[model samples]
Target chain A: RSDAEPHYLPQLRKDILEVICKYVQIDPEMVTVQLEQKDGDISILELNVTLPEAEELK
Target chain B: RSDAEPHYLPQLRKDILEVICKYVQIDPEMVTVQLEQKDGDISILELNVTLPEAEELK
Candidate 1:
């Protein structure tokens, strides 16, 4: 939801990635994480998490 | 903005309230906060903060 300090962005990204990994079947590398702020206030946290491929190996 | 950990929701909410409080006059307790995740990705974080009453006490 939020961070105590601005330095916490990386930790937040990791936490978000872990949550994303639970449902989607994709590597962590495929996901892109971003944290935004304006005037010392947090605005948004975005995750470009990829989904699984339609086909699976037989 | 983003949180360093999933358990950081409370901190995030507190931070957001600080900003909202600047624009509005209302008790912090009247605000409602939520964090949502969909299919492993963080979908949204929202705050339903209340505004102050128009009438002033004499």
Candidate 2:
């Protein structure tokens, strides 16, 4: 028995990546992961991350 | 084989989401994807996308 979750699909993943790539310095090739599709069209995405140490904030 | 690495997280996800939502004209409910949590804490997010057609440049 658990709460129902909405499906996380590929289109959404692309959208999210588009946003992240714009801000973070990480290379696209470095970012890698898989999409899990569950019952009732549910999905959960895990993004591979490698970020440089924060320098001075402007 | 290679060395271990770092990753992205929910806080970062929320942050990235914020940026996209601000600029694009997308419905939040439309975002669908999965977050893959890896051994090195790297998360590769694959999103389901449905972007509006580009209009006149602003």
Candidate 3:
């Protein structure tokens, strides 16, 4: 399957971030939103909330 | 955590479907899109591609 990332619009990006902050408890910086557009309309393709992985013991 | 579904705009839904069909190799019927809205702008929150699970042998 193709693993290409979707394109995102600037205005939609800001809007999506706000929504993510309201719904997700993670920091704003940790949220990633992917969007796709067709026929002048836009849809969100993915919403990723990245959590820091714990460091392995040395 | 809340498991509430996101709200989607009608126009965005149609747009997202077209994008999905172009990008995904799966049948359009197998695709599901979920979207969220903030300040009237829509963002896709999830895209599910359902595959039929094989029936277990009796």
Top model by DockQ, which number?
2
Better of 2 and 3 by lDDT: 2
Chain B TM-score by candidate, in order shown: 0.54, 0.42, 0.31
TM-score of each: 0.36, 0.36, 0.27
- Give per-residue CA lDDT, model 3, range B1-58, as digits (tens): 1223322233333344444444332355654655443453323344443323223512
Spell out the clash pairs found in candidate 1: A2-B12, A12-B4, A20-B40, A36-B1, A43-B1, A44-B1
Recovery fraction of native interface contacts for candidate 3: 0.04
Instruction: Report lDDT per candidate.
Output: 0.47, 0.45, 0.40
Q: How would you encode candidate 2's per-residue C-alpha lDDT over B1-58 as one tens digit per residue?
A: 0111213344445654554455544554544545444576454444443333435624
Cα lDDT, model 1, residue B51: 37
> Each model's fnat?
0.00, 0.13, 0.04
What is the lDDT, from 0 to 100, of the residue B35 in candidate 3?
40
**Model 2, span A1-58: residue lDDT tens:** 0111222233444555555555544565655545444465444344454443444622
Q: Every prediction's TM-score for the first chain?
A: 0.48, 0.42, 0.33
State in Å the error of residue B35, model 2: 2.2
